[PDB]
Motif scaffolding. Structure first.
Motif: not given
Ligand SMILES: [Mg+2]
Ligand SMILES: *[B]([O])([O])[C]([C][C]([C])[C])[N]C(=O)[C]([C]C1=[C][C]=[C][C]=[C]1)[N]C(=O)C1=[C]N=[C][C]=N1
Ligand SMILES: *[B]([O])([O])[C]([C][C]([C])[C])[N]C(=O)[C]([C]C1=[C][C]=[C][C]=[C]1)[N]C(=O)C1=[C]N=[C][C]=N1
Ligand SMILES: *[B]([O])([O])[C]([C][C]([C])[C])[N]C(=O)[C]([C]C1=[C][C]=[C][C]=[C]1)[N]C(=O)C1=[C]N=[C][C]=N1
Ligand SMILES: *[B]([O])([O])[C]([C][C]([C])[C])[N]C(=O)[C]([C]C1=[C][C]=[C][C]=[C]1)[N]C(=O)C1=[C]N=[C][C]=N1
Ligand SMILES: [Cl-]
Ligand SMILES: [Cl-]
Ligand SMILES: [Mg+2]
Ligand SMILES: [Mg+2]
Ligand SMILES: [Mg+2]
Ligand SMILES: [Mg+2]
Lengths: 195, 226, 222, 196, 204, 233, 212, 195, 196
Positions: I19, I163, I166-167, I169-170
């Motif tokens: 991300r 993930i 955490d916004g 991360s993804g």
């Molecule tokens: Mg996420």
């Protein structure tokens, strides 16, 4: 407004106040009388922020005139000055303080003595032989320290006052368009029409 | 400022230094930081001097009226509750940091109070600019089941650590001991390890050294008869 | 933001005698409300019968003293081992200070010694190099406490002679080395009482034609 | 601060560290952040010590007055009183509170109330500065209907990690068990939980 | 800008053997401009003396306020207020303006009429009492005054000796302060007589 | 101008009769996060000096490389590199002090507080401090950060002035240091239990102790503390 | 600070005060505010003490180099312009200086140049510089004439500083008098204000406001 | 400094510039000549920040005088004005710009015409029949719009200039202590000593 | 960003999410944060995309020039070149880099370089905004000398949690395996790692 002076001589008090009224880059008026008669033997000159000066002076005038009618008696200059001081001391801790400095010249008919009081907008009262507000004192106090003698006559006081105005007209940057001079003595208040 | 509180077998002791400062200047060399809330409830104060004095007097006054109303000796938790709710209301603007201690019918108690109104419980506590120097001593030498003599020693040692090492603290050590079933003993200037040495010279001037302009008698008496 | 200046406290005092001079200074070194050292020398012998102290921010103080000592060394090399007179040292120090006019040494400097006529001399500096010879000067944190006392007890200010009542001043009699040391000790004891950054110890350097002597005295450690 | 409340078969358990800090100075290393608003309704406190104490004292007053008039209040009711104070005074408060209680009808319940003043009913909750470091661990290791011994171990291991990584958390691990049996206080010292 | 140093001025008080002394300078200014050299800062209500430094309007206002309160005290109590009691009244009065204070540095001096014991006290602007045995200082040259008093002072001075000490403390402190000086007054106070002396000092 | 990122907390030290002792914990903090648990902050230079560093760790590693390079440079064209012309504590300190003051004067400081502990050629104890501002001072006890506020008071009870140094043994001095480290673990929120300790003696030389732990802690009294005032349960 | 200088029949009068301050703290009462550049050139100083001392001492070195190179004393105009051109280079950097360069030459006669750290350079007959300049102007302007005796002109300069020393809080200490003539400058002593004030009050009958 | 005026008539250019020099609250001088002769038939008046004004004027003067010696020839007013403009246009993007406004009055001997150029500190050049810098134009342009005629004599130009100065002395707050008037024509530059 | 590198028996494995965000907008959901500076020396990138790319490009240049003159560089050497750039330009850079490599002599090594520019050699390392949420999990679950399959599961489970919380991360979980065998790229999609 700009320059207001005061001098206490043997038998009278002389107040001198500039005639100019300047708002911004224009001199709107050159004949403004920056004073109010509080009582027959008490005169108050004033200088400070626009609007506040006149509003305060007239408010004080009204209160003293009210006292005079109620008691059928004129307050002493000392009494009037203390009243004025308290109003300013009250004002300085208000929401919007009166931004006004004053000189109070009066003749005490009881003691047969002239009296000059200098009061700033904070309510700081002092009795003086000669006084000034604003940048005026920076020039005039040195002259008065030299020439003033306490036993002066009214005519000698006016000459000494002319010497102050001449110095101001020479060294100050702003054109204050001359001064209106008023004398306070045992006979009351009168204006010197030629100065 | 260094103030401490120490619990012991049959009661609690508090102590304080005696220095008051305005910036880098010492305003008072023998300041009294131990305040009496009630006969057997005392508290040490740090921070703004007028605030600690005023807040103690006010609560002490209301505690006295409360004691008379209820016909009971006042409790430390009452002083604690009244102090914290007052300080909380003023959102930390009343700069009073207090160590509250005392004995009452419930027993012996020791608390701290911070300016924002938070309270803490403990067997040993310290507040003020010299609290770190004092707490270092307390953490090193404190133990459970202290005697009266040991607690006074530990408390005064903790204040001394502040006196010597913290520039905000100095001069003397004040102590107040509050033992259960006894009168509280207030030991003003318990230690005096900072007496000034003799000066090298006397600066007494010869009479007439100062120039005078005028003299006059001042009338202090009332208006007179006849 | 990074602040390159700090305040290490302390206080210094110079007094000029008739054939001697003293430069005193407390030995305490601080930051904020903590003591760094109870004995950190602040007054230094710089050679050529000159003593110096640069009170305020210690890092700048040490740097300046170090550079002046260096200046004395190179003065000998460049001018055939000539003795650097106290007046010449003072002017040299002005240029060291003013050289950093736009990033100043944050110190109040005082030097002491003897002039070329053998009389006692004290020179005083502001941070940016302005200087002036004086008979008496206190510098540093407690300067405001000590200087008035010295105006009174060294220069006999506001003192007159009994019987005359303000007409005849007190005569400006000279002070001996024993009399000066008494005034120095009382100055620092008084300053220690009312100033938190002053205490621990007092170190005095006395300068005469014979050389540089040292004296140490205990001060209150609270 | 590292605080958490966890529901399990027999009821609910509250858990907390004991550190209070003024910047980097530990003002109190033996703080009690698990505080009682009613017999079997307790709360975990995080954020401002003054704010959370003032709030908790007011809630205890409200529930004491509730009890005198209407009998024992529900855990939901206690959470609502906390919410009302935290929400309406959101501009002036810094309080992160977890409310936990045991009814006989509703059994163990946990409500979390973050800074905003919102309410969230959950099986378990974590909060405080130290909670950030154990979201991963707690999510992976939590199960519903755990035993008392399992839940104590879950909280002990979780707060141990939170303490290890968070500077604002430390000291002893305090716990309070809420069941039909009553109220039990547990304590765990550094030598025990650090070696885990 | 800073209210406590617009007008300038100083007050000092000292104890002696069966006597007290209180002194002040006479300057009133508007920052750099000197305005008046007759502005006395020491007042008295009965036998209790009060010196006040700081903002001049507040100096005047507080004098008028304590005259007001001590007069009502006297009418109700049927006796003059004592220094110890007056000290508490000053503290109370200042603290009621805690978050809008009078910008002043008061100093109380006097002798207790019953016990005969000399008494001095100082205050900060919000009412904190400093009850010193030796001396009290206040004003724009407080640092200077502390230095002078701490060195010159010794206990149990006779009235005429005490006069010299306090005078030299004030004069030399004022001469190292730009906003203080322009004259000085010294009150020597004994149990049943009070002498007031104007000092000759440099007028710059 | 910068801000410190990864940081080390207190370094503490004191003199004793035959030498000096210095200690510092093994933590590298990242704000409130206790990020790195195996950081050595005592760096020996030769067999007669130990430099203890607090503050920014990236800058510490830079200073570590400067000292390592200093030893290499001193050995060049120097037959007496391991004898009369070996590096002294005073030489190592003055070098660092020069660098620290130069860097602050360029408005780009090394964000550290440093204590150089060692023993000179003539057997004299050396202990001196220097920081990001170039400020230097010596004392029988020296400490950085929280150590200054909490360790110094304890260490000054052992050695209060110069005359107390010959009266203080290595056992008493080490005991005081270890106690001070415990107090810091109680009260410093950016400290760790694990620490390193170094002794530099004029007789027995350099003794470097790794993997020490704070022990004999008092926590039992915590069980009796309930609520914050009125609470009984 | 109060410094003045004025041209008259008998050359130039220069008068200065002696006070130095740091905020409200009086740092010195014995400061030399007249700098003897050479036997015929004087420089007054006002504002930053170090700036003024350093650069007017430096000015003397430049004037000495001029007369070595040109076998002739530097003019007052050229001396003043060296200083004004120097401070102009430093404009904006924060130098704080107000000076009068006073001197006499054959080609110019008695000359006064006001020089300032903003780069201003003005020739004139009368100048007062410093925080107490307005007080000095009051006395000076009311009593000035071209036809003054050396004795009367010296007193007027002395009296004008005294006036400012009294009223201005940042002026005082003592009065240093100089008299510049065809044959160079002449020092006329240090006059302590603490003694001069009472002397002038009694003899002149002035300062009736103050009590003595 | 404060007020500088310029007017181009039939056969000459007249520049008027105030005499006052004010630093702070004091008028240090009342006889200051705010102009420099660039060449025998070209005059430049100036106003702006202290120090910069004179430094710039003299720098320009030196450069034009250098050109005159090198070529044994006087530059036209147009050429001098362009040179001056470029220096100011260069200056405005410097580390520390010249804070100076100028009027350039000259008589072109080739074309037998008077020429007036107004240039501000940014390097903004305009040729005008009459010009002013600062607050002066706010009063004077309206008068000149009314009275000015392009075929006025020099004496008529001075009368029209007196009418401008009288208005400024009446309505402006600052006392500028009168003006020094200079005329630029075919015969060169001269000063009107009585005004 | 959630990135990590983990040493194990056969070598070392790098791991990362995919991300890239401009505030709350995902500018790239399939980013490759595992980048190659040498054959068997790779790095994980976090912080500014521009800064970390510019740094990585410069390091690759330095190691390519090193190889031409002095042969294959060590992982320590690669970490030192990263450090030099990050430390000396600390005022102008926002780069959190994990360096990981495989020698035959030194086997698997991991060096982490946070914002300051300091270097830390570790058995495993975690970094990026999402790492905060898995300090607890990773500390409890990491063992030395794990197998390839165990290490892949450890990274997969760890980054899955990072993930989840955490916004920033993804996307997909990218991994790169570094052993004597060679270089292997692995990818894991949302449907796989979310259900863990
Ligand atoms: Mg996420
Ligand atoms: B201690 O340092 O905390 C001490 C304890 C006090 C209650 C006796 N405090 C002070 O001495 C304070 C420090 C302070 C200075 C400025 C603002 C707030 C606090 N001093 C005073 O309150 C003080 C200062 N001058 C006169 C009287 N009181
Ligand atoms: B914990 O760290 O959140 C803790 C919980 C509290 C209820 C004991 N809070 C504190 O320690 C706070 C500061 C803080 C730190 C970290 C996050 C949020 C808040 N401290 C205080 O409120 C405090 C500190 N010293 C004295 C009084 N109060
Ligand atoms: B005078 O007031 O300008 C004076 C002249 C100077 C040569 C001694 N200046 C000062 O006293 C200045 C302060 C100041 C006061 C008023 C106006 C401008 C400046 N003081 C200093 O330069 C100074 C230098 N060293 C120590 C203390 N003060
Ligand atoms: B990750 O979130 O740290 C990520 C790693 C990067 C190397 C792909 N960084 C970013 O997404 C950054 C912003 C950021 C978010 C969270 C922490 C730190 C930094 N984004 C960018 O650099 C970016 C975004 N849009 C366009 C270009 N660059
Ligand atoms: Cl709490
Ligand atoms: Cl990328
Ligand atoms: Mg102390
Ligand atoms: Mg004066
Ligand atoms: Mg030049
Ligand atoms: Mg234009």
């Amino acid at each position: 407004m700009d320059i207001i002076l005061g001098i206490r001589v043997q038998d009278s008090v002389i107040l001198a106040s500039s005639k100019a009224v300047t708002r911004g880059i224009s001199v709107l008026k050159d004949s403004d009388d920056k004073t109010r008669q509080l009582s027959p033997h008490t005169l108050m000159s004033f200088a400070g922020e626009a609007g506040d000066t006149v509003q305060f002076a007239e408010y004080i005038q009204a209160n003293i005139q009210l006292y005079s009618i109620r008691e059928d008696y004129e307050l002493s200059p000392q009494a009037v000055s203390s009243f004025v001081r308290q109003e300013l001391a009250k004002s300085i801790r208000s929401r919007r303080p009166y931004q006004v400095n004053v000189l109070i010249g009066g003749y005490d008919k009881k003691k047969n003595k002239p009296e000059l009081y200098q009061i700033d907008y904070l309510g700081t009262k002092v009795e003086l032989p000669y006084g000034a507000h604003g940048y005026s004192g920076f020039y005039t106090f040195s002259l008065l320290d030299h020439h003033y003698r306490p036993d002066m006559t009214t005519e000698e006081g006016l000459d000494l006052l002319k010497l102050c105005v001449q110095e101001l007209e020479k060294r100050m940057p702003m054109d204050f368009k001359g001064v209106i001079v008023k004398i306070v003595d045992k006979d009351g208040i009168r204006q010197v029409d030629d100065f | 400022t260094t103030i401490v509180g120490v619990k012991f077998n049959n009661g609690v002791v508090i102590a304080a230094d005696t220095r008051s400062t305005q910036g880098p200047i010492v305003a008072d060399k023998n300041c009294a930081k131990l305040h009496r809330i009630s006969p057997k409830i005392w508290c040490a104060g740090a921070g703004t001097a007028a605030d600690t004095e005023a807040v103690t007097q006010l609560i002490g006054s209301n505690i006295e009226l409360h004691s008379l109303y209820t016909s009971r000796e006042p409790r430390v938790v009452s002083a604690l509750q009244m102090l914290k709710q007052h300080l909380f209301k003023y959102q930390g603007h009343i700069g009073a940091y207090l160590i509250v201690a005392g004995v009452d019918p419930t027993g012996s108690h020791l608390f701290s109070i911070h300016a924002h109104g938070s309270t803490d419980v403990g067997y040993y506590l310290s507040l003020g600019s010299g609290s770190l120097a004092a707490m270092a001593v307390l953490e090193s030498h404190w133990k459970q089941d202290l005697t009266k003599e040991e607690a006074i020693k530990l408390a005064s040692d903790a204040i001394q650590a502040g006196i010597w090492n913290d520039l905000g603290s100095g001069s003397n050590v004040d102590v107040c001991v509050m033992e259960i079933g006894k009168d509280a003993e207030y030991l003003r200037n318990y230690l005096t390890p900072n007496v000034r040495e003799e000066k090298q010279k006397s600066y007494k001037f010869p009479r007439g050294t100062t120039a005078v302009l005028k003299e006059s008698i001042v009338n202090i008496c009332d208006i007179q008869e006849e | 933001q990074f602040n390159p200046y700090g305040d290490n406290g302390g206080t210094i005092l110079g007094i000029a005698g008739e054939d001697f001079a003293v430069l005193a200074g407390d030995t305490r070194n601080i930051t904020d409300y903590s003591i760094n050292s109870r004995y950190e020398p602040k007054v230094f012998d710089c050679g050529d019968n000159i003593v110096m102290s640069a009170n305020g921010f210690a890092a700048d103080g040490d740097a300046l003293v170090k550079r002046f000592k260096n200046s004395v060394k190179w003065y000998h090399f460049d001018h055939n081992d000539k003795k650097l007179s106290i007046n010449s040292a003072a002017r040299n120090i002005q240029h060291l200070l003013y050289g950093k006019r736009f990033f100043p040494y944050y110190v109040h400097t005082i030097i002491a010694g003897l002039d070329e006529d053998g009389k006692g001399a004290v020179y005083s500096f502001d941070p940016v190099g302005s200087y002036e010879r004086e008979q008496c000067r206190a510098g540093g944190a407690a300067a405001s406490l000590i200087m008035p006392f010295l105006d009174n007890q060294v220069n006999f200010k506001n003192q007159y002679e009994p019987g005359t009542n303000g007409k005849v001043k007190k005569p400006l009699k000279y002070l001996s080395v024993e009399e000066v040391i008494k005034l120095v000790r009382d100055s620092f004891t008084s300053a220690t009482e009312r100033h938190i950054q002053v205490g621990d110890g007092l170190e005095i350097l006395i300068v005469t034609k014979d050389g540089v002597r040292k004296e140490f005295y205990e001060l209150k450690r609270d | 601060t590292s605080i958490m409340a966890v529901t399990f078969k027999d009821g609910v358990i509250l858990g907390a560290d004991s550190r209070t800090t003024t910047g980097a100075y530990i003002a109190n290393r033996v703080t009690d952040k698990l505080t009682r608003v009613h017999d079997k309704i307790w709360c975990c406190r995080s954020g401002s010590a003054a704010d959370t104490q003032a709030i908790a004292d007011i809630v205890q007053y409200h529930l004491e007055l509730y009890t005198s008039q209407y009998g024992t209040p529900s855990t939901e009711t206690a959470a609502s009183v906390f919410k009302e104070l935290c929400y309406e005074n959101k501009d002036n408060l810094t309080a992160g509170i977890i409310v936990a209680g045991y009814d006989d009808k509703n059994k163990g319940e946990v409500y979390t109330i973050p800074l905003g003043g919102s309410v969230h009913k959950l099986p378990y909750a974590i909060a405080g500065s130290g909670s950030t470091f154990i979201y991963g661990y707690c999510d992976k290791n939590f199960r519903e209907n755990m035993s008392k011994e399992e839940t104590v171990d879950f909280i002990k291991h979780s707060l141990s990690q939170a303490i290890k990584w968070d500077g604002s958390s430390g000291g002893v691990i305090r716990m309070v068990v809420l069941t039909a049996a009553g109220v039990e206080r547990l304590i765990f010292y550094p030598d025990e939980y650090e070696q885990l | 800008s800073d209210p406590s140093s617009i007008n300038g001025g100083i007050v000092v008080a000292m104890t002696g053997k069966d006597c007290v002394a209180i002194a002040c300078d006479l300057r009133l200014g508007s920052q750099s401009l000197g305005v008046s050299n007759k502005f006395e800062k020491i007042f008295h209500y009965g036998h209790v003396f009060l010196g006040i430094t700081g903002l001049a309007t507040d100096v005047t206002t507080l004098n008028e306020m304590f005259r007001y309160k001590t007069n009502l005290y006297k009418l109700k109590e049927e006796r003059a207020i004592e220094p110890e009691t007056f000290t508490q009244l000053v503290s109370s009065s200042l603290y009621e303006r805690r978050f809008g204070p009078y910008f002043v540095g008061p100093v109380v001096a006097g002798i207790n009429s019953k016990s005969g014991k000399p008494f001095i006290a100082g205050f900060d602007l919000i009412g904190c009492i400093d009850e010193a045995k030796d001396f009290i200082v206040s004003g724009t040259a407080s640092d200077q005054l502390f230095g002078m008093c701490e060195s010159l002072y010794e206990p149990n001075l006779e009235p005429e000796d005490l006069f010299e000490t306090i005078s030299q403390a004030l004069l030399n402190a004022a001469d190292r302060d730009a906003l203080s000086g322009w004259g000085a007054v010294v009150y020597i106070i004994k149990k049943d007589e009070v002498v007031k002396r104007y000092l000759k000092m440099r007028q710059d | 101008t910068q801000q410190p990122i990864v940081t080390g907390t207190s370094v503490i030290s004191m003199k004793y009769d035959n030498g000096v002792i210095i200690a510092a914990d093994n933590l590298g903090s990242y704000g409130s996060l206790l990020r790195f648990n195996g950081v050595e902050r005592l760096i020996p230079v030769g067999d007669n000096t130990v430099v203890g560093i607090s503050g920014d760790i990236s800058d510490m590693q830079h200073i570590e490389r400067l000292l390592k390079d200093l030893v290499t440079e001193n050995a060049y064209d120097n037959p007496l590199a391991d004898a009369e012309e070996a590096l002294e504590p005073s030489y190592i300190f003055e070098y660092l002090a020069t660098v620290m003051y130069q860097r602050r004067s360029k408005m780009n400081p090394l964000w550290n507080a440093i204590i150089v502990a060692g023993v000179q050629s003539n057997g004299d104890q050396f202990l001196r401090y220097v920081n990001l501002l170039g400020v230097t001072y010596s004392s029988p006890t020296l400490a950085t950060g929280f150590g200054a506020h909490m360790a110094n008071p304890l260490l000054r009870k052992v050695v209060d002035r110069e005359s107390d140094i010959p009266k203080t043994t290595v056992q008493v001095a080490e005991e005081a240091i270890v106690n001070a480290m415990r107090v810091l673990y109680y009260r410093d929120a950016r400290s760790s239990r694990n620490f390193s300790l170094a002794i530099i003696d004029k007789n027995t030389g350099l003794t470097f102790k790794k993997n020490l732990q704070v022990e004999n802690m008092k926590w039992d009294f915590a069980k009796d503390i309930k609520g914050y005032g009125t609470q009984k349960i | 600070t109060t410094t003045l200088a004025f041209r008259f029949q008998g050359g130039i009068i220069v008068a200065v005060d002696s006070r130095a301050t740091a905020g409200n703290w009086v740092a010195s009462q014995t400061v030399k505010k007249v700098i003897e550049i050479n036997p015929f050139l004087l420089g007054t100083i006002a504002g930053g003490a170090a700036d003024c001392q350093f650069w007017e001492t430096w000015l003397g070195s430049q004037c000495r180099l001029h007369e070595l190179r040109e076998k002739e004393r530097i003019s007052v105009a050229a001396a003043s312009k060296i200083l004004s051109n120097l401070v102009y280079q430093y404009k904006g950097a924060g130098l704080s200086m107000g000076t009068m360069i006073c001197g006499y030459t054959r080609k110019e006669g008695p000359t006064i140049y006001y020089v300032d750290s903003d780069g201003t350079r003005l020739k004139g007959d009368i100048f007062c510089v410093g925080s107490g300049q307005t007080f000095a102007y009051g006395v000076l302007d009311s009593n000035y004439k071209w036809d003054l005796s050396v004795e009367d002109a010296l007193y007027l300069g002395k009296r004008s500083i005294l006036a400012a020393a009294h009223r201005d809080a940042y002026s005082g200490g003592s009065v240093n008098l100089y008299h510049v003539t065809e044959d160079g400058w002449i020092y006329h002593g240090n006059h302590d204000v603490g003694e001069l004030f009472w002397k002038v009050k009694e003899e002149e009958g002035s300062f009736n406001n103050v009590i003595g």
